[PDB]
Assembly symmetry: C5
Homo-oligomer: 346 residues x 5
């Protein structure tokens, strides 16, 4: 019995009229190529460039009546990547590649096996940096949706159709974890058939639903932002005579809030719409700014006040100081309730 | 009937006298190659390097009488990229490439179809990082103009001419959005015929009109810059006796403005001309600096003042403090009006 | 006697029925390829991307009865990399490559020698940037575990099996030092046999146990963080009359702690769980914040106090100031003991 | 008449004894290759790495008697880059490449035309990142000199000589602008013949004279640095009784100057020699530091002063305060004159 | 006479029994390849990654009796890089490459000349980014030692030996300058013969002795660090009554020192051992911290003091203030002497 390598010479060579530039079922129905990808290393989701690097295994299955054999006993011939370049392959590509490369560490990472009926399996390893438009209207409580479409370039709809398989469409690794986001078990599968001036091409896309973990931003940009507001609340228990103490407290705490507000947009795009973290840095900046105007009103009334007028303005400048100890801890409290509840049902 | 792959062997091979190193219509009129590009992924417009990464589909159409066939029934032969390297192709390149590469994810992204009359369509996917000179005289209210020219390298004007098609010259994707800029529907199409020491070559360019969204810079560099000026206005309601309070307020607020003025040029080139944001950081720095000189004049008059001279300087040092509460909120207001109106018609 | 180069022509050529696309022992037992790697340049372990660049020498040994010779006297034929591409090689790859390349400086860094019995040695140089999931629950006192698996891509378990050799499995260079971590002499060797929808493949992995050196973080984020707490302890020896002195001391030292707490996450991922350095920056921030509330209580009691009530509140506002000089230096001391002991046995 | 493509087969092929590995005029005079470059995209001049990226068109002209034809009517044959690799080309390279690549966007950007007398034109597009040693003794008022040399590698002086053409040696694009530097119209052309242990090789270099635009650094590091000195001058109009006001003014303004002095070396190499901007940040730091020692002398004399000694020290502590209002605004003024004049003739 | 190109066909072709896969002097003594490198562009020595980019010319000389000719008159045949790939070349590589590439700007930068006796010169251009372990025990006064070893990969000691030439081993360019380090004229040449599990290979290395220039760090991290200590010395000339002045001076100057101490490790690895700059930032931080405790002791004694006890504590609180004006300027002076002398002989 001749080995499978010499058997491919009589099937892939110039004999039998088999050419690698002809699609199967020519002058007939289009080729239905089913695909299923396996995610190996997901993560590294940048926000300034709005892209994410993923390493998937692209599997392609299509029927080819020209490769059907009957003399070989087994129904699986794991060939060599050398014969892989001498056959026909679908022109599958991604519309959001933005730079990609293969992996040829000691061997071109390609798979090729042919069944008796003509089934051809084609599995390779591709590293992609896919771009996805993100909506940052509520940045700390956003639901990301990273999509990836698989289009055709040379073959139109009447010559090649891409579809998803029924069982096991998108497999996920067991020990695949993410530091910031989380990968939900629900993945939508829809069509993305485009229409250009040349024609229409097939397209299959998968929608990965992600969600950020608030455990990181809560400690960096929320807990320190909440303590600065408390630093302005303590400015009311000090007597009005200590002018350099209360003025310096109302200024040193209002400028460090602007620094944290300006520094909270380091790893963020320059979007125009306001997000959920910008209003938090803005409203909390208003409370520490209102504390400055609070003492300014108390100081102006105290310095404006023979014995009948001064006996009432002192009681007025002190009464407003007692209300401020209950007003701001309650106005900021009702805002803290209306903030997390509004961003919990949207 | 022989397949189209074997038919190309009798048309692209050594037979019929067809060579891939000869342009169509040799020793006659030049080749008129019409082009139309489709934008897939636009964005990532850097400002320090003054470049932007774009992913376009370069389509080229040219007539070739040597490829006219009459035996094949259909008028479209979607060939393989293997035969694409055995024919003649225009030497189209960009004068502002600055690094570029193709996309060969599982298939070389090339398109080739030949009609009966000799029409040859050539569509590929090219990722370009194009450089464009930007005028930042008014950075927050600028109108960017990103151009891209398509020149010839080996064929002069009398051998190859590039032109734009009539219908559908520059197609834009439907879901193409930008975080900072906006892509207008008006795209100019002009010629850029260059003249070197070797000769003259064809050139076609498209002018993309962009515009920044002020919604981002208004919240980061304008709202905090406006609140610092208010921190200097509150220094007038405090009595002149509180020297460590008003001095510290006039210094802690004037130095944080310089930090924001120096930190507002992070993602900006080192241009010499002054922009619209530099004068805003400069004039607002003058207001918070004038508040320091305002108290310095009040403190100097108060410390200079038997009972006839001291009874008038106290009334003078207090009258100037009452005018400053109306002067600066009005001088800064008329400047705020003359600022946004001047940069709204230019 | 013919040279070994011409002898390979009669062994690797079309004669003798030897093809490079057939694995040894075909239609029989699988090939048992033993591997052992040598680490040349280890280090550069990034934390934001969670990867590390390593340069190893991949040695592969497998038997091949088709290469057994008997005419050559010696038992070692150091061939040329040209003949290396004309033989069969295992399809070894890594599941966490994330970009890799070879080294061809003046010569393709490949090794190939064939023994008389059929032993084939294959040594090459590969530069890998391997990703590893890290658990940062206790960042300054963590025990890293960098793993690297060697899987098969085209050959299943019944066709190719990877195993580790007995003596000298993972060799380490003599002068291999690390600036941050340390490489322990204990390296675990286990199996990682995966199961996909196509089939099962062999897998061998090595677990490198690393450990950070606390000598760096102790000086940057611990010693300065401990001195700031002492700056708040000195606020008790100052009299209560100095309001601008004690207030400014309690605010200038509590805001610089937040800056160090926010700046301590520069080269750190955005993980949600709290680490050992976040609680240190949080508890120490509570001590410098409690010093602010300490003086606020003393100032409020002093300003609230004919001669019977004022004679007791002054003694009360001074007694609490004497307890604070012993309380905080002891509450922070017992926390400093419970901190390093808890992170010394876990 | 045979086409020019088939005519090259009888001239570039094995016939006529023409080989691509033999230089013209063998066993005789050396080849005189004249070169002229065209600058397309200049700029991106980094300062930390001391390099600049340039995109030039390298044109090469040399005579070759083996390519002289007499049957073709025209005197220009624009060939294909395929025949370009089958002829002899000079081994021109740059001694300061530091990474380079070609441009093959849809066509290898190469030019090849042969005249009747034997003139061969060779124009290509090369992107170079050239390194140049810069002298930063006066950084804001420096005159940069970026050089680029074209050496030979395999052919010595007696086999190949590089020279510049007479008319149009270095052409510059019309719309070529720079954000920081300026390209002068004077470009020196000299020789750089090197002598190694192997032999001597030809070399041609061009000296591009650049000059920075002070309009950028004047607004960022000079105007804010001048206002801080004024903040220390206002410390003299305040009474000596305001100790927390004048001390805080002399310290908050002297520490922000050190921050600007340390932050003014971000995009700068770590050179040892002092530059023109370091002395400006040093002398201006001395003025704001002398203001601290000025009040320290006034405060020490005021606190040292039955009625005869105190009546003179108060007049002395006030007289020195009046001289400081004229001394420092004049000592800093004469330094400001001696600074810009010294760096205007050197 | 036949040209040298056609003469190589009778020497490098299949005739004469010359094969490119056989080393010279087979079945005999090993090949002694002498090497000498020329440094073109040295510098760019990173500290975080601990590597440096160098551009050297790798020259290799070895005897080959199979290339000896007698018919050609001259003794030098400068061949083409095409024939360079058809001969035998040593398998020279570097053990610390970490990414490398060649230079093929318009020509593969290779040199090949063969003498009559059989001497073969091989010169190429290689760009290397070499890693070197650095000892930063005394960072500002360190003596760097960058090494680079040239090992063999396929040929053992008994088949190929690398050695350095006698005259002109390591040539240095004339205009080669460095911004930070300096290249000494003393370069050690030793052997680095390694022993692996496969065998022993030749190795030659050169030790480049470097030294940093203190002129940069003296102005950025030493002069500003020395002025901050003077800001704490001036806190003694102010009266003890000015509590908000001396407290604010002792805190604003002690926190900016921590910022400079934390910011002095930007371009530095995360090593555990303490360096010479860390102790300078630590001891100087102790002086500005001792000034805070100095006033705390004076303030506590002043606030503790019918007329007999208060008449002595005031004289005691003032006497300690006079000693502090001589103590700290002398304790810091003797430390400044013991610092530069200790790091001048080690
Ligand atoms: C690839 O999949 C498509 C469907 O997604 C297959 O096409 C449809 O194929 C049928 C033949 O099986 C075509 O004929 C029709 O048959 C149905 C009964 O199955 C009958 O009810 C209809 O009236 C019609 O006669 C049908 O036109 C075709 N439709 C389309 C839109 O293509 C296709 O055959 C598959 N290709 C291969 C190679 O299997
Ligand atoms: C490519 O397009 C150019 C025009 O952009 C074509 O060229 C012009 O072509 C005409 C022939 O169609 C040349 O002849 C002239 O004909 C006109 C009538 O159409 C007549 O009024 C003139 O007096 C003249 O006889 C004309 O010289 C030529 N002009 C130029 C500037 O090239 C060209 O033919 C097109 N090429 C192909 C292959 O179609
Ligand atoms: C590669 O290694 C495997 C083991 O890891 C070898 O396989 C085992 O090989 C034996 C033959 O040596 C097979 O037969 C059995 O022999 C044992 C005695 O050694 C006997 O007790 C059993 O009842 C059985 O008859 C055995 O089935 C096989 N097992 C597996 C799981 O593969 C294999 O032969 C090695 N390959 C080469 C080419 O050396
Ligand atoms: C390339 O250019 C060089 C000059 O840069 C040419 O070389 C010089 O060429 C002349 C022949 O033209 C050699 O001969 C001499 O002729 C002059 C009159 O022109 C005569 O006064 C001298 O006494 C001598 O007989 C001369 O030796 C040579 N000099 C050098 C330094 O090379 C060269 O011919 C040019 N190559 C080609 C291929 O055109
Ligand atoms: C490459 O260099 C080595 C030395 O580094 C050469 O090897 C030594 O070569 C000599 C022959 O010249 C061998 O023989 C001996 O000769 C000496 C007199 O020179 C004699 O005193 C000894 O008793 C012995 O007979 C010697 O064994 C050998 N040693 C080693 C360690 O290799 C070698 O010949 C050079 N290769 C070529 C191709 O020139």
């Amino acid at each position: 019995p001749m080995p499978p390598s010499e058997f491919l010479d009589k099937l892939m060579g110039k004999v039998s009229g088999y050419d690698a530039r002809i699609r199967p079922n020519f002058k007939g129905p289009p080729v239905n190529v089913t695909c299923n990808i396996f995610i190996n290393s997901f993560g590294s989701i940048a926000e300034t460039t709005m892209d994410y690097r993923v390493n998937i295994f692209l599997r392609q299955q299509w029927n080819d009546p020209r490769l059907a054999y009957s003399e070989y006993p087994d129904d699986s011939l794991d060939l060599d990547p050398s014969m892989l370049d001498s056959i026909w392959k679908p022109d599958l590509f991604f519309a959001n590649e933005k730079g990609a490369n293969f992996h040829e560490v000691t061997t071109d990472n390609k798979l090729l096996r042919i069944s008796k009926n003509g089934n051809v399996l084609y599995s390779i390893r591709i590293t992609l940096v896919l771009a996805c438009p993100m909506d940052l209207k509520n940045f700390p409580m956003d639901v990301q949706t990273c999509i990836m479409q698989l289009e055709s370039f040379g073959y139109t709809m009447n010559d090649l159709i891409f579809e998803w398989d029924e069982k096991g469409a998108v497999q996920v690794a067991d020990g695949l974890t993410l530091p910031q986001f989380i990968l939900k078990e629900e993945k939508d599968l829809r069509y993305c058939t485009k229409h250009y001036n040349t024609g229409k091409f097939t397209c299959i896309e998968a929608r990965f639903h992600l969600e950020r973990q608030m455990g990181y931003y809560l400690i960096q940009m929320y807990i320190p932002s909440l303590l600065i507001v408390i630093l302005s609340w303590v400015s009311f228990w000090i007597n009005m005579d200590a002018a350099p103490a209360r003025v310096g407290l109302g200024i040193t705490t209002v400028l460090t809030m602007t620094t944290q507000s300006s520094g909270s947009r380091a790893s963020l795009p320059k979007v125009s719409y306001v997000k959920a973290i910008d209003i938090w840095m803005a409203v909390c900046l208003l409370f520490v700014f209102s504390a400055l105007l609070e003492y300014a009103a108390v100081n102006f009334i105290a310095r404006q006040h023979v014995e009948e007028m001064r006996k009432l303005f002192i009681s007025r400048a002190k009464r407003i100081d007692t209300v401020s100890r209950v007003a701001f801890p309650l106005v900021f409290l009702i805002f803290n309730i209306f903030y997390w509840i509004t961003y919990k049902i949207i």
